[PDB]
Write a protein that binds this DNA or RNA. Structure first.
Ligand code: MG
Ligand code: MG
Ligand code: MG
Ligand code: MG
Ligand code: MG
Ligand code: MG
Ligand code: MG
Ligand code: MG
Ligand code: MG
Ligand code: MG
Ligand code: MG
Ligand code: MG
Ligand code: MG
Ligand code: MG
Ligand code: MG
Ligand code: MG
Ligand code: MG
Ligand code: MG
Ligand code: MG
Ligand code: MG
Ligand code: MG
Ligand code: MG
Ligand code: MG
Ligand code: MG
Ligand code: MG
Ligand code: MG
Ligand code: MG
Ligand code: MG
Ligand code: MG
Ligand code: MG
Ligand code: MG
Ligand code: MG
Ligand code: MG
Ligand code: MG
Ligand code: MG
Ligand code: MG
Ligand code: MG
Ligand code: MG
Ligand code: MG
Ligand code: MG
Ligand code: MG
Ligand code: MG
Lengths: 67, 144, 179, 260, 60
RNA sequence: GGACUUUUACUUUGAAAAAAUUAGAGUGUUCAAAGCAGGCGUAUUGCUCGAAUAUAUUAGCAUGGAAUAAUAGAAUAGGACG
RNA sequence: GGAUAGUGGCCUACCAUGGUUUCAACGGGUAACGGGGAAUAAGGGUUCGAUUCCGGAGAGGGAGCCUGAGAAACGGCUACCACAUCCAAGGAAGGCAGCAGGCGCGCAAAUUACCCAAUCCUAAUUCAGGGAGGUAGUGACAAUAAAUAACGAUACAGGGCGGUCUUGUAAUUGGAAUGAGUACAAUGUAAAUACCUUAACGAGGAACAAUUGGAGGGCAAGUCUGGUGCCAGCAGCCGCGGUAAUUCCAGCUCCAAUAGCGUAUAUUAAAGUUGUUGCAGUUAAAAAGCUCGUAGUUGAACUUUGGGCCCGGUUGGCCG
């Protein structure tokens, strides 16, 4: 079985010049997940339709309970 | 020299002469004038799907004497009407006129193939499905 | 948007399709060398005719034309490199005459049988395909190996194959251990 | 086509770059700089293909961002930097220094050089004319301008540069019988020191070059780059020293070193 | 000539052919094995020369 | 540098010349279509060959040839050298 | 002169009367984007290129324009035409010839899935973003390699010359092998999937059971049996069927190609039936009734030949 590998002059050098998927393939980097790419794409657009903080508009939405 | 000029500067005459005489070639002219698209109801395409108008029985040509079963179909993409043969013993019980079928040529450059007077197309599938596969009971005719 | 992965086909076909003389010959050749489809014959005729028009083209070049020499000695070199063209015929005038059969007898199912060890060209094909016989440890199940005449010294079965043996074999262990 | 094209599909990249065909679908577009696009080579290619130092292109940038690489001086961290002919690629790590010189086949080869030789470089002057407040200047193959040059420094002549500073020290001239280097067409790589020039007023003066093998050849003026005196170059040449070995010659001696 | 001939006879003979059922036989060999079988049947023991060869004599 | 040059066709050689394609070299993708890889030791900290060649051919450029086929030249001498 | 970034009838003013054309202008057609190129292999040719690279054009049809270095941009705006959505009837919003996916059209063409790991690109920039691109699915588009079997023993039988050499035809046998599949595992991968490795399984005819055409000629393979009876049907073409059908419908046996094979349409060779190479024209298709004659094609012969000296090249011989 032919392949290819490499050894570092330290582990702090490997943990910084080595791909993260490899670090997790080993167990030297945690596998903490993230939401589906398409999901955050939708979130990006959903966020673009808002201008500003978005904190002062919940005011009017909950303030039209009268109207 | 029997005609054609052999001078070294008569290339124009030679090329235009052959360009003009190539019109005597049927294949060349057919492809150039575009008869395939104007005439020849198929749009020049390989096959064409149509609807069956009537179920005819054509008197065979002589010296033969039979009744070739065919169908008059109206091409859906063009509206033209053509008479096409439904070949093999039976297969006329499978046409069920006002059904949907597909037509192919006869492998004769139009020029209706046999003793069937003026028919240059044949049926391939009725109700869209494998006429020969219907002949041999591999498939079954759909509900409608 | 991405480079086109090149391709080409390896088999020509006789124009006349129903020449009984050529058909009978073709069949005996197939049945002799252990071929399965006649196209493995059509194929060999294809590469042959290609090599032949490649040589015959140079043969009308002015004798000793530079590219003629380079590609000529290159062609004869690779042909002897595989062992089809005799070493006495190394000046390329004999390459126009490499009858097809010389190529077939230089296959691997052929040699696997010629140096005995298969007792049939068919047993040969079956063994080559069944995890058996290698050159070194390089098992090869392509009966059309075209052995290079140098690797022809090492044809002993692979280590694994329970025919020169590494184990009894799947059907044997139980045909015998079923009691 | 509405503006500047910032991509480079594969099969459009220079052939002398030696890029495998199936490696995805695009090549790295060289950036704007000292050398013409079709007449250069980028760092990504050097550090990845020629030197096999970086495996991915992602790793090449990680290498450059540490200021390890410097060319003709400064760091030059542009992954797509258009490093060209005669440029000097030093390397803080490994103590290595390289000069960009072609083969006889026409591609850029890896050629290590001395730390001493890495301090200078040459350039074929491509233009010379007065400028700001009457001070004359010179612009050459490099893509750099040197103010106050010698009044004998004419066009098409080579020049030696300090690279610690800008000013030049020596300036070889384009005269009959001076070492030349062909950079153009695929006679590019051949070397041989001058035969004579055909003026041909109106454009495209042609140069006659004789390699030091009694073999003639011709090229166009903007393709020849004088490098010095016969047998006496001004830089460290590469193996084979550009003498156009024939296909049969190279194959013959390729089979010469036969036994291991 | 006439174009409206009758159509009652469609599939007349296929309809009235007493359809004999196929008969089970051995599983024949594939390409190498099969064409080898033909190599043998045709070039190992010629089965007949009372004149020339015949590949399918029924009553001969 | 100056002063002045009858016009053409043809043929030679060469430069200019994108890659893939094609013809084609090398390399044993287990074969092959392919790919441009790969091959070597001290396989412990390296050694090493490559990534050819050909091809453009009409037109333009450059160069040798002076047959073939044209054009022009001195006749009201308003000719040629000085 | 104006305008442009700038040359220019680009535009204006004045003036003139020029400019292309049988050496085919001008107009028409194109089921026309151009090119690198593809198919067909004596050669000369013939035919095709929407389509992975290069160039151009466009974003439903036009026109106009803001920003800017760069757009007459359209996943920018403005207007008109056509299409067309939401509504509280007041109004508002849309531009898939991007990725998928949908309708229609049709002979005719796949998932509304995964990732920035690779290849490269952009930004303030090692980090973010990238339906560019890469993964898988769908996928007999085409292309490569090539399983569906291999050895026995025996038994009458031939032939070698029943014995001992197998030709093998055998309707009981025989122990061997293996992947198609299945699956620990590792590898593979961004994470998966397949492929490469490989434990456990995993073949005797009920199988892991090859097909598709054809069997009068061209054209390879039966004047076998049954049926039918110019009916049904076959038949590229020549021709078969009207009661023993070598052709139809079948059973049987056989041939060709074989994981492929048939059909329709086009195209190329064959085609020396487009003929430059290379056709034919008395009678088979074809010399204007006749002469003139412009364009075009073509057009006799003759001008430094011959002789002398030199140099040094490249094969190959006798030698080595
Ligand atoms: Mg994202
Ligand atoms: Mg924001
Ligand atoms: Mg006529
Ligand atoms: Mg009618
Ligand atoms: Mg329509
Ligand atoms: Mg760049
Ligand atoms: Mg004017
Ligand atoms: Mg006028
Ligand atoms: Mg005309
Ligand atoms: Mg169009
Ligand atoms: Mg033709
Ligand atoms: Mg195109
Ligand atoms: Mg076209
Ligand atoms: Mg179109
Ligand atoms: Mg494009
Ligand atoms: Mg546009
Ligand atoms: Mg649309
Ligand atoms: Mg309009
Ligand atoms: Mg627009
Ligand atoms: Mg859009
Ligand atoms: Mg856009
Ligand atoms: Mg309201
Ligand atoms: Mg879409
Ligand atoms: Mg399809
Ligand atoms: Mg995509
Ligand atoms: Mg995609
Ligand atoms: Mg099977
Ligand atoms: Mg079985
Ligand atoms: Mg059959
Ligand atoms: Mg026959
Ligand atoms: Mg007739
Ligand atoms: Mg009867
Ligand atoms: Mg009967
Ligand atoms: Mg009968
Ligand atoms: Mg039959
Ligand atoms: Mg075929
Ligand atoms: Mg000729
Ligand atoms: Mg004729
Ligand atoms: Mg007559
Ligand atoms: Mg007459
Ligand atoms: Mg007249
Ligand atoms: Mg003459």
């Amino acid at each position: 079985s032919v392949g290819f590998g490499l050894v570092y002059n330290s582990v702090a050098e490997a943990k910084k010049f080595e791909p993260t998927y490899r670090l997790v393939r080993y167990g030297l980097a945690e596998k903490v997940e993230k939401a589906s790419r398409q999901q955050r794409k939708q979130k990006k657009n959903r966020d673009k339709k808002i201008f500003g903080t978005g904190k002062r508009l919940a005011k009017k939405v909950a303030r039209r309970n009268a109207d | 020299g029997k005609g054609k000029p052999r001078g070294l500067n008569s290339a124009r005459k030679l090329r235009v002469h052959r360009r003009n005489n190539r019109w005597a070639e049927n294949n060349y002219k057919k492809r150039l004038l575009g008869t395939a698209f104007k005439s020849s109801p198929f749009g020049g395409s390989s096959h064409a799907k149509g609807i069956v108008l009537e179920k005819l029985g054509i008197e065979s040509k002589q010296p033969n004497s039979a009744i070739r079963k065919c169908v008059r179909v109206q091409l859906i993409k063009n509206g033209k009407k053509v008479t096409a043969f439904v070949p093999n013993d039976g297969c006329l019980n499978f046409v069920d006129e006002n059904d949907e079928v597909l037509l192919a040529g006869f492998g004769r450059k139009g020029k209706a193939k046999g003793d069937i007077p003026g028919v240059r197309f044949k049926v391939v599938k009725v109700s869209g499905v494998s006429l020969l596969a219907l002949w041999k009971e591999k498939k079954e005719k759909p509900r409608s | 948007p991405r480079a086109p992965r090149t391709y080409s086909k390896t088999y020509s076909t006789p124009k006349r399709p129903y020449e009984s003389s050529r058909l009978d010959a073709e069949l005996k050749l197939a049945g002799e060398f252990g071929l399965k489809n006649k196209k493995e014959i059509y194929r060999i005729s294809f590469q042959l005719s290609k090599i032949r028009r490649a040589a015959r083209d140079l043969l009308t070049r002015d004798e000793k034309d530079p590219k003629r020499l380079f590609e000529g000695n290159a062609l004869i070199r690779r042909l002897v490199r595989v062992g089809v063209l005799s070493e006495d015929k190394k000046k390329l005038d004999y390459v126009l005459a490499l009858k097809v059969e010389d190529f077939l007898e230089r296959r691997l199912q052929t040699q696997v049988y010629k140096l005995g060890l298969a007792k049939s060209v068919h047993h040969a094909r079956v063994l080559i395909t069944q995890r058996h016989i290698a050159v070194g440890k390089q098992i090869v199940n392509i009966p059309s190996f075209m052995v290079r005449l140098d690797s022809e010294k090492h044809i002993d079965f692979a280590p694994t194959s329970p025919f020169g043996g590494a184990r009894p074999g799947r059907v044997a262990r139980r045909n015998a251990a079923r009691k | 086509a509405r503006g500047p094209k910032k991509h480079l599909k594969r099969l459009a990249a220079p052939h002398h770059w030696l890029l495998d065909k199936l490696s995805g679908c695009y090549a790295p577009r060289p950036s704007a700089g000292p050398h013409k696009l079709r007449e250069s080579l980028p760092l990504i290619v050097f550090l990845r293909n020629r030197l096999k130092y970086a495996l991915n292109g992602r790793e090449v940038k990680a290498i450059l961002m540490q200021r390890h690489v410097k060319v003709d001086g400064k760091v030059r961290t542009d992954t797509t930097y258009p490093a060209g002919f005669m440029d000097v690629i030093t390397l803080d790590a490994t103590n290595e220094n390289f000069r960009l010189v072609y083969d006889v086949k026409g591609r850029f080869a890896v050629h290590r050089i001395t730390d001493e030789e890495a301090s200078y470089k040459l350039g074929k002057v491509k233009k010379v004319q007065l400028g700001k407040k009457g001070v004359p200047y010179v612009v050459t193959h490099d893509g750099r301008t040197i103010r106050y040059p010698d009044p004998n420094i004419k066009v098409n002549d080579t020049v030696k540069i300090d690279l610690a500073s800008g000013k030049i020290t020596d300036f070889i001239k384009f005269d009959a019988g001076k070492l030349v280097y062909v950079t153009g067409g695929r006679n590019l790589g051949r070397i041989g020191t001058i035969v004579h020039k055909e003026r041909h007023d109106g454009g495209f003066d042609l140069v006659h070059i004789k390699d030091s093998l009694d073999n003639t050849f011709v090229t166009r003026l903007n393709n020849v780059f004088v490098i010095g005196e016969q047998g006496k170059p001004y830089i460290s040449l590469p193996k084979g020293k550009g003498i156009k070995l024939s296909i049969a010659e190279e194959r013959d001696r390729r089979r010469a070193q036969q036994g291991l | 000539a006439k174009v409206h001939g009758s159509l009652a006879r469609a599939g007349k003979v296929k309809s009235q052919t007493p359809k004999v059922e196929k008969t089970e036989k051995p599983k024949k060999p594939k390409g190498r094995a099969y064409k080898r079988l033909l190599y043998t049947r045709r070039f190992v023991n010629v089965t007949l020369v009372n004149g020339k060869r015949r590949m399918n004599p029924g009553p001969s």
